[PDB]
Design a protein around this ligand. Structure first.
Ligand SMILES: *CCC(=O)N1CCN(c2ncnc3cc(-c4ccccc4F)c(Cl)cc23)CC1
Ligand SMILES: Nc1nc2c(ncn2[C@@H]2O[C@H](COP(=O)(O)OP(=O)(O)O)[C@@H](O)[C@H]2O)c(=O)[nH]1
Ligand SMILES: [Ca+2]
Ligand SMILES: [Ca+2]
Length: 168
């Protein structure tokens, strides 16, 4: 039925590929090529409605390109991923949201804030601080672990729900 282009963004090392490969292939990768950018496709039923998801896992370099902008424009929703043990990656969220706003030429873009690595005890970003950030953005916040699979489906499916809400 409906096709959704989902884009997974966030700093290096936060778990973007690990989340995406869990969702698609149902295993946890311990180290995956940090530069590679690929898309993945999956059909899922969400709220009784079949959804064909096309998921772009971002990586590459810390640089502007017209080519990356082109692909980011195709996205209909974005996962803003940080790691709960990496404060810099949380500080970086703001940058990704701003660059999304730029390429979509919209401040109302479907997004979900994802705090990954929830299985690690050594947390440095409090749930409250991330919840307050998500509240300021008007988006959901979901804690995940690509390692245990806690919240992985929920994060992607909540982003599809956000895209559906926005399209109406
Ligand atoms: C370790 C490799 C990795 O995961 N990344 C490389 C650095 N990336 C990155 N660095 C800075 N800026 C961005 C900006 C974007 C972006 C551009 C336009 C719209 C939306 C958007 F997120 C991206 Cl895709 C990656 C950047 C990515 C992480
Ligand atoms: N403990 C833990 N490690 C994770 C989790 N997600 C990713 N990692 C690890 O963190 C590192 C970076 O993951 P990766 O998916 O390559 O990050 P990316 O640069 O954002 O794509 C790898 O060692 C992964 O195994 C998680 O939820 N829990
Ligand atoms: Ca990656
Ligand atoms: Ca909103």
């Amino acid at each position: 039925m409906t096709e959704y282009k989902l884009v997974v963004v966030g700093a290096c090392g936060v778990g973007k590929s690990a989340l995406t490969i869990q969702l698609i292939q149902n295993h946890f990768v311990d180290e995956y090529d940090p530069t590679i950018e690929d898309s993945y496709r999956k059909q899922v039923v969400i709220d009784g409605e079949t959804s064909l998801l096309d998921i772009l896992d971002t990586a590459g370099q810390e640089e502007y390109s017209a080519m990356r902008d082109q692909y980011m424009r195709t996205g209909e929703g974005f996962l803003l991923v940080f790691a709960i043990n990496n404060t810099k990656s949380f500080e970086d969220i703001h940058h990704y949201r701003e660059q999304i706003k730029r390429v979509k030429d919209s401040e109302d873009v479907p997004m979900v804030l994802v705090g990954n690595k929830s299985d690690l005890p050594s947390r440095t970003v409090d749930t409250k601080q991330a919840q307050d950030l998500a509240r300021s953005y008007g988006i959901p916040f979901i804690e995940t672990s690509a390692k245990t699979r806690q919240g992985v489906d929920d994060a992607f499916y909540t982003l599809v729900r956000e895209i559906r809400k926005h399209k109406e």
